[PDB]
Write a protein that binds this ligand. Structure first.
Ligand SMILES: [Zn+2]
Ligand SMILES: [Zn+2]
Ligand SMILES: [Zn+2]
Ligand SMILES: [Zn+2]
Length: 304
């Protein structure tokens, strides 16, 4: 049978972990003995920085990186890293589903990459070992970020020192003080045990953590036409399921963090969140040229 390896960096009980397993389940039911899907979670096959290489060499067939990890391949997806760009999940989704959003699935056509869909995880929450209530609280702290120039600028704006690190390394980075804070949707905090090394988590909802499911074009377009049709439809069905349950999964993990009795969750007043927005939101200007001013204008159109 055709072997499709699906490699990723997250735990199994997460939006993407559940999505990859559902794709396996449905594909193997629908194309019995014709296609096998092998899922490799937790960087067990390929980790951050090295999965793109694997995809293009043909060592893996599907990956689903954070939208924040494509700056070396396209400058357009950086739009999803802009702090406080999207007001809510619906806006992010409306942008992703718009004609412009869909065209971004082909933004790496020249690198032999096909975009299969957007998978929603959730908005990011700040964490540290000190209460982060207002921007000045972040001053002098070292924050782990995904490998994104936008996210680096986000923290530089609040006089913090960002450090790019691969996802598998964050827990150890926090425990050893290499970094003392970070940002993550709830499910990535709980599943990587980061609450055990982060005393305070602020419900800031200050940016998006979503994925683009991608494949190798040469591989995908080389599949039998009948097989690809079923795979594409199945992936679309998985995308719907992932997206409908991501918020609920993250809420479950928020509650699991509360029940773990390791951390305190800080809620922000509208005014407090407004302070963070004023401090960080201006970073957009530094990337307008690369992203496209009109693209950013379309993103704002999604907020309504
Ligand atoms: Zn807004
Ligand atoms: Zn999202
Ligand atoms: Zn969500
Ligand atoms: Zn063919």
């Amino acid at each position: 049978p055709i072997v499709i390896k699906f490699s990723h960096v997250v735990a199994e009980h997460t939006p993407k972990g559940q999505g990859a397993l559902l794709f396996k389940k449905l594909v193997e039911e629908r194309l019995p003995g014709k296609v096998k899907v092998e899922v490799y979670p937790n960087s067990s096959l390929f980790g951050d920085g090295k999965e793109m290489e694997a995809l293009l060499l043909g060592d893996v067939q599907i990956i689903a990186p954070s939208l924040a990890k494509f700056e070396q391949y396209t400058k357009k997806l950086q739009i999803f890293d802009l702090p406080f760009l999207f007001d809510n999940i619906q806006a992010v989704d409306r942008f992703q589903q718009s004609p412009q959003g869909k065209e971004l699935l082909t933004s790496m056509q020249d690198k032999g990459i096909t975009g299969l869909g957007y998978w929603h995880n959730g908005m990011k929450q700040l964490s540290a070992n000190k209460p982060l209530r207002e921007p000045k609280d972040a001053r002098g702290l070292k924050f782990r970020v995904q490998a994104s120039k936008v996210l680096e600028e986000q923290f530089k704006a609040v006089r913090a020192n960002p450090r790019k690190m691969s996802f598998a390394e964050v827990y150890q980075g926090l425990q050893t003080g290499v970094v003392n804070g970070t940002e993550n949707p709830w499910s990535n905090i709980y599943s990587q045990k980061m609450h055990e090394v982060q005393k305070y988590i602020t419900e800031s909802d200050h940016g998006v953590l979503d994925y683009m499911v991608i494949t190798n074009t040469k591989f995908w377009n080389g599949l039998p036409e009948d097989v690809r049709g079923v795979l594409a439809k199945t992936m679309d069905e998985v995308t719907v399921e992932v997206n409908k349950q991501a918020e609920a999964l993250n809420q479950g993990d928020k509650q699991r963090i509360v029940e773990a009795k390791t951390s305190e969750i800080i809620e922000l007043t509208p005014e407090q969140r407004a302070e963070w927005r004023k401090a960080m939101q201006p970073v957009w200007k530094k990337f307008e040229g690369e992203i496209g001013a009109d693209l950013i204008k379309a993103a704002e159109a999604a907020n309504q």
